[PDB]
Amino acid sequence: YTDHDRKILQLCGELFDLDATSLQLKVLQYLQQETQATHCCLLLVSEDNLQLSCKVIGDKVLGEEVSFPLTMGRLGQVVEDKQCIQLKDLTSDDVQQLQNMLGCELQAMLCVPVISRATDQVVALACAFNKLGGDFFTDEDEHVIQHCFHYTGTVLTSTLAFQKEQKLKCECQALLQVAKNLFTHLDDVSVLLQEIITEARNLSNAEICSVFLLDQNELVAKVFDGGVVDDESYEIRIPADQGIAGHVATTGQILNIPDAYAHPLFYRGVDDSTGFRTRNILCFPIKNENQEVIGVAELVNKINGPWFSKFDEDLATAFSIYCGISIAHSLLYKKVNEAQY
Ligand SMILES: Nc1nc2c(ncn2[C@@H]2O[C@@H]3COP(=O)(O)O[C@H]3[C@H]2O)c(=O)[nH]1
Numbered sequence: 368y369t370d371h372d373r374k375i376l377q378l379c380g381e382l383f384d385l386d387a388t389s390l391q392l393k394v395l396q397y398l399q400q401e402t403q404a405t406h407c408c409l410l411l412v413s414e415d416n417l418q419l420s421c422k423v424i425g426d427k428v429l430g431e432e433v434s435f436p437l438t439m440g441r442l443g444q445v446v447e448d449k450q451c452i453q454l455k456d457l458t459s460d461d462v463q464q465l466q467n468m469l470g471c472e473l474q475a476m477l478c479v480p481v482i483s484r485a486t487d488q489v490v491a492l493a494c495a496f497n498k499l500g501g502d503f504f505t506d507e508d509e510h511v512i513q514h515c516f517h518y519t520g521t522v523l524t525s526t527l528a529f530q531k532e533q534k535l536k537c538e539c540q541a542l543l544q545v546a547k548n549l550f551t552h553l554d555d556v557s558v559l560l561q562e563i564i565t566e567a568r569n570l571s572n573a574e575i576c577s578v579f580l581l582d583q584n585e586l587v588a589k590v591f592d593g594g595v596v597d598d599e600s601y602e603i604r605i606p607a608d609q610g611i612a613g614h615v616a617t618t619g620q621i622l623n624i625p626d627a628y629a630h631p632l633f634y635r636g637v638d639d640s641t642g643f644r645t646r647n648i649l650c651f652p653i654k655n656e657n658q659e660v661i662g663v664a665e666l667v668n669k670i671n672g673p674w675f676s677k678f679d680e681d682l683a684t685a686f687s688i689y690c691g692i693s694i695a696h697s698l699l700y701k702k703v704n705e706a707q708y
Contacts, residue, residue: 371401371511375518382519387527391423394519399425401515402477402508404495406469409481411491411527412437412446419443419492424469433468440464442478446489451479451509469496477504479512481520490524554701556580557589557596559693560653564664565593567686571649571679573666578653579605579612580662586612589662603637610634612663615650619660621683624648625674649675651683653690664690 378397382390395407410419413434419442420434437443440461445452454476457465466473477495482488493512495504552558560578568576578590588596588603596602607616614632615622627633627645638645650665666683669675 371514374401375515378515379518379522382522385526387523387530388423388428390523390526392426392428394515394523395423396426398493398495398512398515401511402495402504403498403500404477404504404508405497405499406471407496408468408494409491409523410442410494412489416446421468429468435464442492445478445480445492449480449482449489451477453477453504465494465496471497473497475502475504477508477512479509481516483520483524484517485521490520555595556694556697559697560662560664560690561590561593561595563686563690563693564590564666567664567682568593568666571666571675571682572670572672573649573675574668574670575643576664576666578662578664579616580653581607581616581660584608586616586663590664605634605637610636611648611650612665615652616660616663619652619654621651621680621687622648623675623680623683624650647674649679649683651687651690653687653694655691656695661694 374397378394381393384390384393391409395409398404398407406425408421408424410421412419416437418434418436420432422429422432437446440458441452441456442461454462454473457476462473465476474497476497479493480489481491481493483490493516495508495512498504557578557580560580564576564578567573575592576590577588577592579586580589581587582604584607586605586607588605590596591603605612607613611622611624611627611630611632611634613634624630624633625647627648628635633645633648635645637643646668648665648667650663652660653662653664655661664686666675666679669679
């Protein structure tokens with residue numbers, strides 16, 4: 368009736384939410400008035416046409432969505448036959464189920480199937496329970512429900528389909544992300560760069576070693592404490608002109624500091640952050656084929672010594688070159704391998 372034609376348009380204008388659950392609570396509550404039912408709910412038909420699911424009952428959003436086979440009772444037949452039914456028609460099991468969900472005595476019921484105008488299939492079963500007034504839902508109630516979804520259904524089907532597809536998509540992209548990571552980490556420069564400076568660390572007898580690749584006015588610790596950081600989360604970045612690291616990144620010349628603390632250029636920040644203390648620092652640059660500093664590296668703290676020797680200083684030179692020569696043979700072999708293929 369135009370009485371309900373106006374009430375609907377208002378419901379429609381009020382179905383602006385992007386979440387299917389919220390769009391249901393509003394439609395459900397509309398019906399609980401126009402039918403005088405205590406609790407309403409939509410039993411959504413799955414894709415495989417094998418189950419019924421429910422997420423919202425009345426104004427209560429079930430913490431977990433409930434689902435059960437269409438086999439499991441008389442309701443599944445409504446999906447096939449497209450004819451409403453009532454309490455008197457439900458199997459004992461149906462009542463038991465709907466009651467486990469509703470959490471109360473099931474005194475009255477009307478179940479109108481919702482038919483897609485697009486596919487003409489039963490998309491869901493709209494249910495009215497326990498009428499406060501009568502004990503049987505009218506014939507007028509079957510029409511108001513039916514009426515509502517003629518205008519209301521599509522937006523609910525879309526908002527729900529949208530969220531299903533989105534959740535599916537993410538789950539998939541995520542799994543793809545796992546895989547991508549597992550393979551794009553192979554040609555990571557920080558992997559050989561790491562084992563190289565780990566060699567230097569041994570030969571020079573330092574406690575730790577770290578490599579800092581320059582990132583446009585911000586040195587990034589790709590290798591730190593001997594291991595490949597492996598995450599920009601607990602990263603380690605710094606201004607490309609500060610400290611000894613930055614001073615080498617700027618002069619491109621090896622620096623051997625016997626006492627970090629007592630040096631004008633030493634940056635204590637990293638230490639009082641990590642809670643580690645830097646005694647000596649033997650920092651060498653890592654240049655590209657353009658002979659330009661692309662990153663810097665350092666051997667930290669001499670073991671069984673007051674500082675890094677002249678010999679150690681030589682390793683720094685040799686490893687500075689070997690470092691660049693290795694990034695090279697790697698750039699060339701990366702191509703003369705992916706091209707061959
Ligand atoms: N804990 C830790 N500190 C490091 C490592 N490498 C360099 N540093 C410290 O971080 C500092 C940043 O630049 P500094 O000139 O202050 O010199 C560096 C060291 O004190 C490393 O592998 N581990």
